[PDB]
Amino acid sequence: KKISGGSVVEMQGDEMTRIIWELIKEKLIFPYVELDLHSYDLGIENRDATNDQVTKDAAEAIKKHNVGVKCATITPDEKRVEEFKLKQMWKSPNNTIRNILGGTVFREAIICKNIPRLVSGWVKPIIIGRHAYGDQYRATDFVVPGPGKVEITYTPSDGTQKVTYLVHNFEEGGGVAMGMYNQDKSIEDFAHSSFQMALSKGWPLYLSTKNTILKKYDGRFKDIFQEIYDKQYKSQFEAQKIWYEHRLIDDMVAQAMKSEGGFIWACKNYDGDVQSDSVAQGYGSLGMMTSVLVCPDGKTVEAEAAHGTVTRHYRMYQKGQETSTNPIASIFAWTRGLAHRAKLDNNKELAFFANALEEVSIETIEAGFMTKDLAACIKGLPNVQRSDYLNTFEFMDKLGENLKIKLAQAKL
Amino acid sequence: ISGGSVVEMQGDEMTRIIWELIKEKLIFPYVELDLHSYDLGIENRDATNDQVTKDAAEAIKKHNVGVKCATITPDEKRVEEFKLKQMWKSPNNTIRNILGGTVFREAIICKNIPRLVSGWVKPIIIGRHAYGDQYRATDFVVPGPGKVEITYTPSDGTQKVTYLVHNFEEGGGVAMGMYNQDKSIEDFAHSSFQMALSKGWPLYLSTKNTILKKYDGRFKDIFQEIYDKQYKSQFEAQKIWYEHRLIDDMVAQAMKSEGGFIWACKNYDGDVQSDSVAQGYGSLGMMTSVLVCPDGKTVEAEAAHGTVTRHYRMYQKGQETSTNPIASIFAWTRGLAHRAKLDNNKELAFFANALEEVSIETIEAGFMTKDLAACIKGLPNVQRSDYLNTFEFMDKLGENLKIKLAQAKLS
Ligand SMILES: NC(=O)c1ccc[n+]([C@@H]2O[C@H](COP(=O)([O-])OP(=O)(O)OC[C@H]3O[C@@H](n4cnc5c(N)ncnc54)[C@H](OP(=O)(O)O)[C@@H]3O)[C@@H](O)[C@H]2O)c1
Ligand SMILES: NC(=O)c1ccc[n+]([C@@H]2O[C@H](COP(=O)([O-])OP(=O)(O)OC[C@H]3O[C@@H](n4cnc5c(N)ncnc54)[C@H](OP(=O)(O)O)[C@@H]3O)[C@@H](O)[C@H]2O)c1
Ligand SMILES: O=C(O)CCC(=O)C(=O)O
Ligand SMILES: O=C(O)CCC(=O)C(=O)O
Ligand SMILES: [Ca+2]
Ligand SMILES: [Ca+2]
């Protein structure tokens, strides 16, 4: 007997993550759950075939059904075009999806009692609230061919005025230029959910910017946050014996490095992206981090793995070599989507399973069964022997059996 | 010791206090220079309408060596704090825009200082691009619905290319425009490659070319074109390599590395990542920062951290404090060393190095600031007996620099 799951939007990806995603479905999802799954193949071949429409279609299904689970995808550059014989150098599916849905990507490492960190202090978790909208992820970058003038212009809707700003005057040779932006409502939602997360977890909140250099752009964030804090959350923080503090990114990164964790870190889009990878790695592995996009509507979520398609490990796989790619971040992408689905649908069993799987995952690693990366945390990469770890198939076989054991034990 | 021509930039807050101690105890008692001093303090800048900065920058150009103390970059709160005419631009953005080049940043290590990042056993050198991007950009507020368009217009004026950045349909927000020059990128690559070869370590350039295909792609394209057509052979001979990576991957790789590489960074990335790297080895006060200009003759040395406002507020409150002066002493040594290099000066070169060795020796001897004591004992366990206050630490350095030089004169 399987659990009556509900409506889940599914997005298939590329390379190593594609191989893993199917193994998750085959072994951990479908033998226990019955879903009205809405699959979109966001692999580079089908994206190129549909002229990236499948990506737009996948984002719209998430709006409709409120739950989306995404597999890591290839964002094409010149090399990829040449590799896959692509029509165009397509935009990142994540950028496309995130700009349509909006909200905040909450990124948090998954801990195991036996997995040593690279950063000594981090005894308490760090949660990054990455602003999933605007900035460099909806930018307008172009190449300046030669001497000329680059200008950024603004024209209000009423046609009553116009502002022109000199970006630069290329007096000799060419170069590059780019325009980027953000909206107040998007920043406001970001602030709201950033403060809300701090209260639910009971931790101080930090907002990093470079407002000293970007006095207007970065200052708008600093102000919008502060205003909403003073006028809507200040008292509640004092109630919970926590605080909100804006800091320059410079200070912030150095502060976290020497901290002991236990704080919500509100991050501007780009900083969120880079810093979650620094954080993930500092705890242990890049394959050991949850990533959930919480939309401003309070009811829609998009869960994924923070890492990419693990191209390097996939090339070993193609060559027929031994592979040990971490599927935990991709497994939790499923458990987090299902956990929210259960919450939306008042589903006791689905919630139980979503959690059961997360516990199964951690327990297996805490039992000595892990991938190479996790073995490298224990013994150090140069000292890692073959017997120390399990391969991607071997590790999914252990998770599979342990999950069968756990659910059978649950039925009493 | 006649040092020669050295451009000096006075600073602000805690670093303004320390700067005078380096001059009072460690530089003037042993060196007499043609000090072209410029006060880049927040008051003088406001008085001179930021001209002193533009002048200090043109002075480093003429004299080829400049030493800079940390300065306050004004925001809205500082305009209230100092009663400012305007929110003046960072003296650093001005100086770096006029001079150009790469800011090479590296942590100063001591055998007794535990790190925060377990694996860093070889040094990480950041090659920060000192020009363009977020540091000479136009940002502004969009107060309501309307269009934001970026446009390029060639010199001949026979073409125009507009570009919709965003059409704001309901409500406003913020918008910004930024740029970088092909020649500056070319200079950056040249210095990065040359740095890799001198040190004998691989080079890694990190960008976001999958997102900013045209902009970050020009950086990836210039580095590869130069490496292939000029340095590949030189690299391959020393068993070293060049490899471009996405910033995400680079930071995760740096964290799990043993160090031992040159990290070429876009202006912003260099800014932030150099702080992550400095704190990871130990503290923000334990890092060298040198701007190496495209002529290869010009250099501007400085401290990577800020003016240390939290420390300066205690000093203002008549409180003891314990701030790291090494980062700021090395700004002096690294300038004096380059001056000696251009001048072909033997004594000044010997002295610049002597001061560096004393600095490290004192800390490995056990005489240190609070930051370095927190590395050993952990901040919740540090006692007053474990460290020295800023004056006390400068007293030991001064005493030891006196020992070293008298011992050096083989007397
Ligand atoms: N969510 C997304 O859709 C997303 C996010 C990021 C990147 N990407 C895309 O993925 C492609 C490749 O990106 P990339 O190679 O720079 O980044 P990546 O796929 O995250 O992998 C970079 C390196 O990180 C380590 N790593 C990442 N995930 C791991 C896991 N689960 N288990 C063990 N190690 C893991 C591996 O290091 P070692 O080789 O040293 O073991 C790997 O080679 C690009 O096309 C990019 O656009 C997509
Ligand atoms: N190159 C430059 O001219 C430069 C660079 C960056 C910032 N700034 C300016 O500095 C001002 C204040 O900056 P900020 O407060 O953001 O950063 P900061 O000056 O670097 O100080 C922030 C924190 O970093 C630690 N720290 C930094 N340097 C230290 C040292 N030498 N010894 C011991 N601890 C050190 C202290 O940590 P604890 O709190 O734990 O004691 C301190 O509170 C701003 O006005 C900014 O514009 C100047
Ligand atoms: O969209 C991409 O190309 C990579 C996505 C990424 O870096 C992230 O989501 O953390
Ligand atoms: O110009 C500034 O405000 C200083 C920026 C900074 O932190 C640096 O020099 O790395
Ligand atoms: Ca990322
Ligand atoms: Ca900095």
Swiss-Prot record, chain A:
The keyword Repeat does not apply. The modification Phosphoserine is found at residue 387. The modification N6-acetyllysine is found at residues 79, 222, 231, 241, 319. Its EC number is 1.1.1.42. Substrate binds at residues 75, 92-98, 107, 130, 210. Acetylation at Lys-372 dramatically reduces catalytic activity. GO terms for cellular component: cytoplasm; cytosol; extracellular exosome; extracellular region; ficolin-1-rich granule lumen; mitochondrion; peroxisomal matrix; peroxisome. It holds the Pfam family Iso_dh. Changing residue 130 to C: In colorectal cancer and glioma samples; glioblastoma multiforme; somatic mutation; found in patients with cartilaginous tumors; abolishes magnesium binding and alters enzyme activity so that isocitrate is no longer converted to alpha-ketoglutarate but instead alpha-ketoglutarate is converted to R(-)-2-hydroxyglutarate; induces histone methylation; enhances expression of chondrocyte-related genes; disturbs the formation of cartilaginous matrix; inhibits osteogenic differentiation. The modification Phosphotyrosine is found at residue 40. This is Isocitrate dehydrogenase [NADP] cytoplasmic.
UniProtKB/Swiss-Prot annotation, chain B:
It comes from Homo sapiens (Human). This is Isocitrate dehydrogenase [NADP] cytoplasmic. NADP(+) binds at residues 71-73, 78, 256, 306-311, 324. GO terms for cellular component: cytoplasm; cytosol; extracellular exosome; extracellular region; ficolin-1-rich granule lumen; mitochondrion; peroxisomal matrix; peroxisome. GO terms for biological process: 2-oxoglutarate metabolic process; female gonad development; glutathione metabolic process; glyoxylate cycle; isocitrate metabolic process; NADP metabolic process; NADPH regeneration; regulation of phospholipid biosynthetic process. SMART domains: Iso_dh. It is linked to Glioma: Gliomas are benign or malignant central nervous system neoplasms derived from glial cells. They comprise astrocytomas and glioblastoma multiforme that are derived from astrocytes, oligodendrogliomas derived from oligodendrocytes and ependymomas derived from ependymocytes. Genetic variations are associated with cartilaginous tumors such as enchondroma or chondrosarcoma. Mutations of Arg-128 to Cys, Gly or His abolish the conversion of isocitrate to alpha-ketoglutarate. Instead, alpha-ketoglutarate is converted to R(-)-2-hydroxyglutarate. The modification N6-acetyllysine is found at residues 77, 220, 229, 239, 317. The modification N6-succinyllysine is found at residues 122, 396. Homodimer. Acetylation at Lys-370 dramatically reduces catalytic activity. The gene is IDH1. Its main location: cytoplasm. NCBIfam families: nadp_idh_euk, PRK08299.1.
